[PDB]
Amino acid sequence: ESADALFVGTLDRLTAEHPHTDDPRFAFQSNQWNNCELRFTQFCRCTRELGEDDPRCKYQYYRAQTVCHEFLLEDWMEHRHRGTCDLDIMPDRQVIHMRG
Amino acid sequence: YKTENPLYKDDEPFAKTCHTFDYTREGTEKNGLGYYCLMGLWASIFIWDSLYTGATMPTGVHRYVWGPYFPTAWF
Amino acid sequence: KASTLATGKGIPGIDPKLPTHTPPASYDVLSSGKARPVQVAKWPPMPGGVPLPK
Amino acid sequence: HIPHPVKYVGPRRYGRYVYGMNRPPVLRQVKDWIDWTGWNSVFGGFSFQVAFGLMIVSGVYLNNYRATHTLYYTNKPDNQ
Amino acid sequence: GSIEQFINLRTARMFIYGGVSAVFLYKATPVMYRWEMLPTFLVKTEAYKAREAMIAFDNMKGIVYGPYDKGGLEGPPTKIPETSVGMMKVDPM
Amino acid sequence: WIYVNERQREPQENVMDHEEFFRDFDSIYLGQVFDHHRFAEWLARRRAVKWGYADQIHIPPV
Amino acid sequence: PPTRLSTPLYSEGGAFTVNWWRNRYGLYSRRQTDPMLAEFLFRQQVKEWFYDVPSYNYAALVGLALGILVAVIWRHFLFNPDVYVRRQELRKMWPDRHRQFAYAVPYLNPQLKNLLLPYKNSFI
Amino acid sequence: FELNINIINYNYLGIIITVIISIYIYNNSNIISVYNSNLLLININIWMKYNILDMLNLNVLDYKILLWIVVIIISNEILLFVSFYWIYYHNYINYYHVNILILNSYNIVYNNIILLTLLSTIVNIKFYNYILSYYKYILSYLIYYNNYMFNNKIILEYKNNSNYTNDSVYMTSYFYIILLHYIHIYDSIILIVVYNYVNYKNINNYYININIYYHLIEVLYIVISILLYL
Amino acid sequence: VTRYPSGTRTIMSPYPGGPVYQWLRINYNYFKRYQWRRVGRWQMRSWCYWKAAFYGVPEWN
Amino acid sequence: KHFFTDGANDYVTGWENTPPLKFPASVMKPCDYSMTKPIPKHWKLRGSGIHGPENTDLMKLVLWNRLKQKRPQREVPNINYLKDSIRLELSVNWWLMSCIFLWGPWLHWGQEYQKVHEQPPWAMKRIDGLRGEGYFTWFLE
Amino acid sequence: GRRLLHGNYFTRYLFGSLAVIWIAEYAAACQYGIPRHRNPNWMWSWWLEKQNQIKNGEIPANTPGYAMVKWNNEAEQRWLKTLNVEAMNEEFARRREAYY
Amino acid sequence: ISTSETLNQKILRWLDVTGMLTRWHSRREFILDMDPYFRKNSGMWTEWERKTLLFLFYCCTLATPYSAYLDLQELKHQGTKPPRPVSLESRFMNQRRYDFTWMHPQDKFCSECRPVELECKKMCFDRYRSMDYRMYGFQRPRIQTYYSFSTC
Numbered sequence A: 001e002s003a004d005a006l007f008v009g010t011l012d013r014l015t016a017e018h019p020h021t022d023d024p025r026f027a028f029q030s031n032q033w034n035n036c037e038l039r040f041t042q043f044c045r046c047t048r049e050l051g052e053d054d055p056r057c058k059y060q061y062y063r064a065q066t067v068c069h070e071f072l073l074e075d076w077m078e079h080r081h082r083g084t085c086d087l088d089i090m091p092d093r094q095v096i097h098m099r100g
Numbered sequence B: 001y002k003t004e005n006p007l008y009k010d011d012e013p014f015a016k017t018c019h020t021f022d023y024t025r026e027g028t029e030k031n032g033l034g035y036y037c038l039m040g041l042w043a044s045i046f047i048w049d050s051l052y053t054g055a056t057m058p059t060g061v062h063r064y065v066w067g068p069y070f071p072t073a074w075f
Numbered sequence C: 001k002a003s004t005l006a007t008g009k010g011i012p013g014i015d016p017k018l019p020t021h022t023p024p025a026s027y028d029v030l031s032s033g034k035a036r037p038v039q040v041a042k043w044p045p046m047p048g049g050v051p052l053p054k
Numbered sequence D: 001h002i003p004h005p006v007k008y009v010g011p012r013r014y015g016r017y018v019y020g021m022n023r024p025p026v027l028r029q030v031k032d033w034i035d036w037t038g039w040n041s042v043f044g045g046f047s048f049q050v051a052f053g054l055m056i057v058s059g060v061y062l063n064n065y066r067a068t069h070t071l072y073y074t075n076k077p078d079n080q
Numbered sequence E: 001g002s003i004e005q006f007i008n009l010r011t012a013r014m015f016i017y018g019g020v021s022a023v024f025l026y027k028a029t030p031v032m033y034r035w036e037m038l039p040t041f042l043v044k045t046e047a048y049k050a051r052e053a054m055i056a057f058d059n060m061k062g063i064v065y066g067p068y069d070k071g072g073l074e075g076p077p078t079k080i081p082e083t084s085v086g087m088m089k090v091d092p093m
Numbered sequence F: 001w002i003y004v005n006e007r008q009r010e011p012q013e014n015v016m017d018h019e020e021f022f023r024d025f026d027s028i029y030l031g032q033v034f035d036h037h038r039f040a041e042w043l044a045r046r047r048a049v050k051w052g053y054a055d056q057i058h059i060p061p062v
Numbered sequence G: 001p002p003t004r005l006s007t008p009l010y011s012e013g014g015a016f017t018v019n020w021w022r023n024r025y026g027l028y029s030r031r032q033t034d035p036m037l038a039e040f041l042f043r044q045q046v047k048e049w050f051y052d053v054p055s056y057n058y059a060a061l062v063g064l065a066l067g068i069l070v071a072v073i074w075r076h077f078l079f080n081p082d083v084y085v086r087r088q089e090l091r092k093m094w095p096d097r098h099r100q101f102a103y104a105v106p107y108l109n110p111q112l113k114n115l116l117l118p119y120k121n122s123f124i
Numbered sequence H: 001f002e003l004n005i006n007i008i009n010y011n012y013l014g015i016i017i018t019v020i021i022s023i024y025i026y027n028n029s030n031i032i033s034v035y036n037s038n039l040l041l042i043n044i045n046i047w048m049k050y051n052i053l054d055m056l057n058l059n060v061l062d063y064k065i066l067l068w069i070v071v072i073i074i075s076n077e078i079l080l081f082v083s084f085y086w087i088y089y090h091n092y093i094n095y096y097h098v099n100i101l102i103l104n105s106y107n108i109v110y111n112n113i114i115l116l117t118l119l120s121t122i123v124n125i126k127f128y129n130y131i132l133s134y135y136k137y138i139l140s141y142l143i144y145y146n147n148y149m150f151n152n153k154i155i156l157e158y159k160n161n162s163n164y165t166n167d168s169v170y171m172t173s174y175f176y177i178i179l180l181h182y183i184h185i186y187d188s189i190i191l192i193v194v195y196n197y198v199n200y201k202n203i204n205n206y207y208i209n210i211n212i213y214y215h216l217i218e219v220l221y222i223v224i225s226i227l228l229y230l
Numbered sequence I: 001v002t003r004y005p006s007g008t009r010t011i012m013s014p015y016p017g018g019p020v021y022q023w024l025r026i027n028y029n030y031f032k033r034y035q036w037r038r039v040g041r042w043q044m045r046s047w048c049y050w051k052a053a054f055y056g057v058p059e060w061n
Numbered sequence J: 001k002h003f004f005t006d007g008a009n010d011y012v013t014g015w016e017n018t019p020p021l022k023f024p025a026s027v028m029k030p031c032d033y034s035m036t037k038p039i040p041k042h043w044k045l046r047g048s049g050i051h052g053p054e055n056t057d058l059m060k061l062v063l064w065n066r067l068k069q070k071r072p073q074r075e076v077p078n079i080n081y082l083k084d085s086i087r088l089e090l091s092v093n094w095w096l097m098s099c100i101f102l103w104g105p106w107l108h109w110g111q112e113y114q115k116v117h118e119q120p121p122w123a124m125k126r127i128d129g130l131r132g133e134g135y136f137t138w139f140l141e
Numbered sequence K: 001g002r003r004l005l006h007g008n009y010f011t012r013y014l015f016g017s018l019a020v021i022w023i024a025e026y027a028a029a030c031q032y033g034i035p036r037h038r039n040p041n042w043m044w045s046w047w048l049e050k051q052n053q054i055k056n057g058e059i060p061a062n063t064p065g066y067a068m069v070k071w072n073n074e075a076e077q078r079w080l081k082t083l084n085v086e087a088m089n090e091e092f093a094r095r096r097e098a099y100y
Numbered sequence L: 001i002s003t004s005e006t007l008n009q010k011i012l013r014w015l016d017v018t019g020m021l022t023r024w025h026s027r028r029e030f031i032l033d034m035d036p037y038f039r040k041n042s043g044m045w046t047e048w049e050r051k052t053l054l055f056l057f058y059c060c061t062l063a064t065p066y067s068a069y070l071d072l073q074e075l076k077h078q079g080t081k082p083p084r085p086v087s088l089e090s091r092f093m094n095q096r097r098y099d100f101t102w103m104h105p106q107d108k109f110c111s112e113c114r115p116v117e118l119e120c121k122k123m124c125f126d127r128y129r130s131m132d133y134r135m136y137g138f139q140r141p142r143i144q145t146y147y148s149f150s151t152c
């Protein structure tokens, strides 16, 4: 309700209420690749917590589509289904802190 | 006779001619106190930034004896 | 050296006839003629110099 | 450059080596050597490593110990 | 009184210096132990034992014959290729 | 000579199963530093199993 | 500009002066083989390049261009949300890079952008 | 009176070297390329002989000319490495969160930095002897031992690395930067194998060139170590 | 003052050393000067890259 | 110094623009006739007047710059010059000592600590549940 | 003997440049009010909560992260078929007894 | 044990077994260890230059054993390098537009394997051997060869 409610809670909310507008974290740059990757990671984390059938995660996918072209999503969604998507590996099976 | 060990003699001066080399007024011979003050500040900023990690996020609440327009209210 | 005021004559530590410092020399007899008493301490000095009763 | 005098004030000769007799203490000799060959190289050479080591090891207290008691939202225990 | 006979320069230099050392080690040794600075052969910390107790040398699983795990349910190949069987020139036992 | 001498030797086991590695992370990831001789022997036995010459070699005891 | 080698040239003290320039001008020179000839060639160069009024205009232009250049480089490194030199945030997934997201809005609203955007009515 | 310069009127090495280069392109066998490289080495050595024989002109400016050429070349070597550092940092935003194992910061960097430092000390001793009109036979063989160990260590690292060039631009940049340094290390072997005492001493451009080049390569490794390992 | 052959007697001690020590000192001195340094002299003289550039050039009159 | 400079570090030819300071001015002096008094009008120009070997000082400079190349003994430079000649060499040697006795010890301590506690002694222990050593330069995090 | 550069040029411009870089960065952080407290962890809140449950003993030790999600990819289904946390814990317990 | 010398002298004598210390403390002994051709130029050296040269030379030669120790440990570490998890094939991992043939443009050995991918090549060489084509390498167990740095 509050006028600044969107900024309150998360920076994510801003684009969730206005899907086709600039995200505060990426509005400074015309290139929106990083924006797409954040949105996909957020869809991946939603399903892990709520499942695919949850309306929330379905909307997190619509939000990802708003910024990600279909040819990228289809490829990244196949990697996710196989279990090779680097944005969805469970954190205890990551290797980012190993050997350096 | 008396002699001087050449290894401990002083450096020869530049010749005094129409074309004379002089570095005395340049002050570039060695690092000065200012340089060592830069090193001290760098060490200080390095330690401070790590010790006090909430300094960049200060509190806007201010009392300020003698109000805000007194000189000790700007530091 | 130190033969002229320019060369350093009269400047202590620079003149051969003037020492850097002038500490009083030690003496073994008092000026009264009594032998100078000698004390050897085995404990640190009293805090204020406070003398102790005889 | 600026012509300057030789700054070495230590002993210019120890005398002929006679089975290591009548020679200064070892540490005195080490100090005289560096005086004779210049401390600028010592300071210059060791400066880089000293700086890097001091910064990395300083994290033992600045980044690790302090941090353990830095998070203001950690001292609070749940269900207490 | 009656201790002055002992009080002496050598007896003092080894009393201040030696006592200072007695407190330097008594106060620093626990810190060195905590921070793994002590030699391992001299003593092993409890944290060292806790980690070492988790180490064994008898695991013979996970052998694969491919550089990548490409997901799926089949996983990386686990069977040695036929063409590679008996290709090793092992010296006679 | 460095290259030739190395090329003759069988390849070391660069990688293992992703899952099995993380189920025994500490032993595998840290075994070398804690005891290198036993880790070396364990590696050798795994190479003998991966290339099917285990029954043709006698791995020296550690 | 004096025409006689007997008349000395005035020099300030510092790292860019007539004395500082004399010391270094002939370091790589095969033509300054003696004092008289060295001074003549030195004053010839100084007269030609430093007593030329229009040459100072280019000095201004190089300073201005270089100052802008150094500052734009520094500004990117120090403030641009997309330039990473530290690695803490690069070792995390995008949703978790809060410290880097803090640069975003302040960087999105520079002063000149606020000052000049109202003047679009002179182009449309 | 003589002319200031003894003009060189004709030269035929240029044609040969340029043809040798073409063979690299116009060939159907990689063995031909190996033998072609030997031809290149031979003819480049002839050009070096021409430089040594130009000493007979007793021209003071010859040392200076060659020295400044080396300065320009060193500059080009530094700028090529800069281009690789640029390629590396341009994709920095995609590093450190990918499922690859980056290199440790303890073993490789330390032994390599310690090794390359010893190489510098040897070259420095060679320079010192060069100044003192003296020679020490063992010095060159210490360089050979250092190069052998460097080659032995780099070969094992590459063979035992579990990530490949096609895995990520990070891995490609790591391998390429390390290879570029190695190539410059190998070029140092090419130069140093001929080190000997020449009695014309400090009018020999070889000595100054070797000192500069070795320092460049070691300094370049300091930059690489900070970027990749530390 | 007695002068010994170069590299054969130590100046660090009045005691010349024991049999093993003397053997090591004498034989290292021989190996360096008359065996190891054969390689260096051979490389310096017989395989000089700068002598080879002047091979076949007339003498300077 | 290593690099050759025609003006200062001219070791290829050994040319020096001025004579040694040891020589009396009556024997040899720097070539500087900028203070020559005005020529009387009744004097007539005999020589070319061109700057060159007709001037006594320049002639002596050329002569000395060639006859100085043979000398009975060395002209020992002072210790300041000798230090400067090998400044880089000495500094690199001390750098090697630092790398062995300063960098070496604490790097070893960090790895040993890492073995037991998973992360180096100068890093913040993680709670995310990820495994591995993690970063080493904590101030670049 | 004539000098071209600063007498201590190498150390001066190396350490000096580093000092200016560090100081300028602190100033930049202050002007933008950037949080300066280093966090070495991931910020996925649900994950950090699961990790606390493991530290509290609510979730058994060495339980994989894919044994706790509400959606599993194909590769994690493959792993779940061979997962036995109870056996893993017993094996670790046996190792501790042997060591002590 | 000789009692004709002090303990310090004995230690220094043994550190002088190769004559290093004697050459430092005697100019005559240093010049007479030079080969005659270079001894000709020795008289010009200052004692500063001589001992500084020995110091730089001695520091270098005394650190070579340390570097050798560090390098041996490196070889042993690489010789028993721990296995690492098999890489999951991520979004941008293992992309290929054409086979790997730049090493063998005409022969095209191991077109599917990467240039230094030793395990892929071993299995590929085995196929060629099974096809009556000899290839070198990847046949001797590591522990049965010299210089492997993998022995217990």
Ligand SMILES: CCCCCCCCCCCCCCCCCC(=O)OC[C@H](COP(=O)([O-])OCC(O)COP(=O)([O-])OC[C@@H](COC(=O)CCCCCCCCCCCCCCCCC)OC(=O)CCCCCCCCCCCCCCCCC)OC(=O)CCCCCCCCCCCCCCCCC
Binding pocket: B031, B036, B039, B040, B041, B042, B043, B046, B047, B051, D039, D040, D041, D042, D043, D044, D045, D047, D048, D049, D051, D052, D054, D055, D058, D061, D062, H112, H113, H114, H116, H117, H120, H215, H218, H219, H221, H222, H225, H226, J087, J088, J091, J092, J095, K007, K008, K009, K010, K011, K012, K015
């Ligand atoms: C109760 C106490 C409580 C605690 C309080 C704590 C307070 C803080 C403590 C910390 C200290 C703060 C100090 C502040 C003021 C400092 C003032 C000062 O003296 O600074 C100047 C001092 C030295 O500067 P300087 O006075 O100009 O030097 C004098 C020279 O002697 C001038 O002579 P020169 O210039 O003639 O020198 C010789 C020079 C002569 O050279 C020449 O002639 C010029 C040559 C130039 C061209 C060179 C050609 C290329 C090289 C060829 C040779 C290559 C060899 C190596 C090859 C390697 C191959 C791998 O040679 C060289 O320097 C270079 C050649 C030698 C070899 C170079 C090796 C490579 C270097 C580059 C890489 C460096 C990074 C390596 C990283 C590791 C490896 C990857 O610098 C520093 O001390 C560094 C900065 C210090 C301040 C920042 C500290 C930040 C962190 C502080 C944390 C502390 C702990 C806090 C804990 C808090 C707990 C609450």
Ligand SMILES: CCCCCCCC/C=C/CCCCCCCC(=O)OC[C@H](COP(=O)(O)OCCN)OC(=O)CCCCCCC/C=C/CCCCCCCC
Binding pocket: D047, D048, D049, D051, D052, G069, G070, G073, G074, G076, G077, G078, G079, G080, G081, G082, G083, G084, G085, G086, G087, G103, H226, J139, J140, K014, K015, K018, K021, K022, K025
């Ligand atoms: C010698 C002793 C040992 C020294 C060891 C040093 C080891 C590390 C060296 C690393 C490289 C040098 C830079 C070090 C920087 C340290 C401070 C730091 O982390 O800075 C980070 C900061 C930004 O960090 P983030 O928070 O991730 O980004 C936020 C959004 N932008 O980056 C920097 O400031 C460093 C990078 C830029 C360095 C150079 C300064 C920038 C301007 C360059 C201008 C170039 C043009 C010419 C200038 C000429 C002179 C005016």
Ligand SMILES: CCCCCCCC/C=C/CCCCCCCC(=O)OC[C@H](COP(=O)(O)OCCN)OC(=O)CCCCCCC/C=C/CCCCCCCC
Binding pocket: H106, H107, H110, J100, J101, J103, J104, J105, J106, J107, J108, J109, J111, L070
């Ligand atoms: C009355 C005053 C008394 C003061 C007494 C002061 C005593 C100070 C003692 C300091 C001891 C320091 C010991 C350091 C030991 C380090 C050993 C070590 O790490 O060895 C291995 C390590 C390399 O290990 P890697 O496996 O390759 O791993 C790292 C690279 N990957 O080797 C090195 O670091 C080599 C250098 C070893 C240096 C040892 C330093 C010893 C210093 C002794 C000082 C004694 C001072 C006494 C002062 C007395 C005053 C009265």
Ligand SMILES: CCCCCCCCCCCCCCCC(=O)OC[C@H](COP(=O)(O)O)OC(=O)CCCCCCCCCCCCCCC
Binding pocket: B027, B030, B031, B032, B033, B034, B035, B036, B037, B038, B041, K012, K013, K015, K016, K017, K020, K021, K023, K024, K027, K028
């Ligand atoms: C191409 C990239 C190159 C590398 C990066 C370049 C970065 C920029 C250039 C830096 C070059 C420095 C070289 C070293 C010069 C040197 O040491 O120069 C040294 C000089 C002193 O000269 P002396 O040695 O003669 O005393 O230092 C100074 O002049 C400063 C003295 C100390 C001042 C202490 C207090 C400073 C307060 C600063 C506040 C800043 C606030 C900012 C708000 C926005």
